[PDB]
């Protein structure tokens, strides 16, 4: 004869849905502690700024400069407090920078002749005075002229440089001729292999922090041995340098969970989940070594025999 | 492995007995073993049949014009999904069939094993799936074998003499 237990567990099999067994173990992790641990991975909390805002140099998160990460946690309370802007490919720039894993900025020496630099707006108030993005340089006319800028910056290093620049779309034609001189501007940034030409569009837009105009953010990657030429006769938010680009295990996550001190291998927007089990049902968004996602709420593996109480 | 035939004409169940005593040849069908096999096959079918796929809006799978990366990626995704589910369909059918054959061959041996234990030292296995009872069995005695109420002690003395 064999043994039996008084309190068995119901387990699924090929023949039938329910068979009692002596004991079983759950194979789906359906619980979270509600907090994110920071020991095995580097967690960076973007409390009030998004990755793009930190990349661009928003006035209220200068703390994120030259900050590396293994996981950028984005909070739903993030807000922008600078000149209104848009990115034609927001998801591409967010993905590219997040996987880079470093907001490291090396300021190059850019010679702009015949223009006035360090422009600003009342929308970005750095302290009591009007300012701008710290990693973008606004160029205005110098007196009564905007000479056609033709700058160059070669590559002699062994890593890829990411250049973030922009085009300013002013609200009115008077604003364009007051800021720049040409009625219709043009910005062309080209490498030896790729070109990008953007003509600014004049028109009124919704009112954000006092500005009816916008800024369109673009990016260009220069490989080793390449060269970057910036040509524009107006409406150029010039770059101040380049961001070092690296490959590695780095991503961005949108969560509202707080960060605590523990050792958890995987991170989920609902918190950190244990990694012993093979499957999990907490969330489909994960970072690190964690179980696969299944639709099932429970899955029991039979660590025992049938449980008939009081081939063989 | 000892039954090497299938009794066509067994039309009241999947398993059963036939005997040749002094009264004459008879035929009967077992019902506990038959419904056990049918229940397990029925339970297997229900688990396979369950409908849990409910999809409303998906990507476009047929294309009229010729586009580039996006169209090719969509074709790659659907082809990958079809091959994976086609493989799952083959393995599932192959696995559940081999279990059905083994399930049905086991139920015959289980019936044979319990009939052997019933005739404790009153019968001899004869290679094929038939016993040789060494005492006079009437129709009632054969019925008690199928019912489960066969007393092996009343016939024991006369069976042991015939055996040896």
């Amino acid at each position, epitope marked *: 004869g064999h043994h039996a237990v008084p309190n068995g567990t119901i387990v699924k099999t090929i023949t039938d849905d329910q068979i009692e067994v002596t004991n079983a173990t759950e194979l789906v992790q359906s619980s979270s502690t509600g907090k994110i641990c920071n020991n095995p991975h580097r967690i960076l909390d973007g409390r009030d700024c998004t990755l793009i805002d930190a990349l661009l140099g928003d006035p209220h998160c200068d703390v994120f400069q030259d900050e590396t990460w293994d996981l950028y946690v984005e909070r739903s309370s993030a807000f922008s407090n600078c000149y209104p802007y848009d990115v034609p490919d927001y998801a591409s720039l967010r993905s590219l920078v997040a996987s880079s894993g470093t907001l490291e900025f090396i300021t190059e020496g850019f010679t702009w002749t015949g223009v006035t630099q360090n422009g600003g707006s009342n929308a970005c108030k750095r302290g009591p005075a009007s300012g701008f993005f710290s990693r973008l340089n606004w160029l205005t006319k110098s007196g009564s002229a905007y000479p056609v800028l033709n700058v160059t910056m070669p590559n002699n290093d062994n890593f890829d440089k990411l250049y973030v620049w922009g085009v300013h779309h002013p609200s009115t034609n008077q604003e364009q001729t007051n800021l720049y001189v040409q009625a219709s501007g043009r910005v062309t940034v080209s490498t030896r292999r790729s070109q990008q030409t953007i003509i600014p569009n004049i028109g009124s837009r919704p009112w954000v922090r006092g500005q009816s105009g916008r800024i369109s953010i673009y990016w260009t990657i220069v490989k080793p041995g390449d060269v970057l030429v910036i040509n524009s006769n107006g409406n150029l938010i010039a770059p101040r340098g380049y961001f070092k680009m690296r490959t590695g295990k780095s991503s961005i996550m949108r969560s509202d969970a707080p960060i605590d001190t523990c050792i958890s291998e995987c991170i989920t927007p609902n918190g950190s989940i244990p990694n012993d089990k093979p499957f999990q049902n907490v969330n489909k968004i994960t970072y690190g070594a964690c179980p696969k996602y299944v639709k099932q709420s429970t899955l029991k593996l039979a660590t025992g025999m049938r449980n008939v109480p009081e081939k063989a | 492995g000892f039954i090497e035939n299938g009794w066509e004409g067994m039309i*009241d169940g999947w398993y059963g007995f036939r005997h040749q005593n002094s009264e004459g040849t008879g035929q*009967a069908a077992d019902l506990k073993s038959t419904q056990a096999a049918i229940d397990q096959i029925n339970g297997k079918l229900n688990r396979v049949i369950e409908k849990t796929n409910e999809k409303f809006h998906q990507i476009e799978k047929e294309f009229s014009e010729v586009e580039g990366r996006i169209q090719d990626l969509e074709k790659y995704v659907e082809d990958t999904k079809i091959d994976l589910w086609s493989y799952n369909a083959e393995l599932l059918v192959a696995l559940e069939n081999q279990h059905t054959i083994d399930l049905t061959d086991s139920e015959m041996n289980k019936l044979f094993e319990k009939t052997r234990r019933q005739l404790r030292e009153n019968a001899e296995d004869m290679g094929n799936g038939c016993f040789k009872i060494y005492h006079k069995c009437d129709n009632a005695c054969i019925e008690s074998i199928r019912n489960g109420t066969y007393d092996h002690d009343i016939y024991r003395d006369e069976a042991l003499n015939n055996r040896f």
Partner: antibody
Amino acid sequence: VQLLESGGGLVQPGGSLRLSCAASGFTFSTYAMSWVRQAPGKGLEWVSTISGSGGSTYDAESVKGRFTISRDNSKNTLYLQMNSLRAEDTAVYYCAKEGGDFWSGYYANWFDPWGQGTLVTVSS
Amino acid sequence: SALTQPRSVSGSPGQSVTISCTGTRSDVGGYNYVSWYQQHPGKAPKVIIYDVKKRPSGVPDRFSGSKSGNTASLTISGLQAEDEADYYCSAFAGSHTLFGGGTKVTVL
């Protein structure tokens, strides 16, 4: 599908009675059939069942040696024979059909159609 | 012997009612041939649930069945006036069919 019962009536104790259930609307030789009785005011009690070919018959213990079951697949009629009737046999007798279509013809796991029933009574 | 069923179960309209049919290991726990029949007064019984959790064609989806070891349960959801009848449970015991005592459902 329609099952019609007949033969119910008053019989003295120890008497005999024969009930016929005429079935139309389905292949009678494919499906198993059963007799189920319900005493007046009490619950349901199974009586007998028969296979598709009629070779296998199953009876309840309180009925085993007394009542027998039979079929005539040519006439599509199901017959139950009462031989020794007691005071506890007064009930309404239904003829039922195996409602399953999975290897039908062996046993009645459930009874999809039921007849209106025939009432048999025993008394002095 | 016979299956055990409660004498009566009552529930207010719109509620849920569960009927328990407790059997042995050869009746309910040995097979999946449990069936439920509804008998209105003076009428022949009709099937509501054949095979533990299956319904015929022509029965409201309110009715549901389940099995837990040796006890089989029938759940009536959205209880209403036309559900007031006697409910019986059937099981297969290897060599015979067993019927329950009978539970009378009353709607408040």
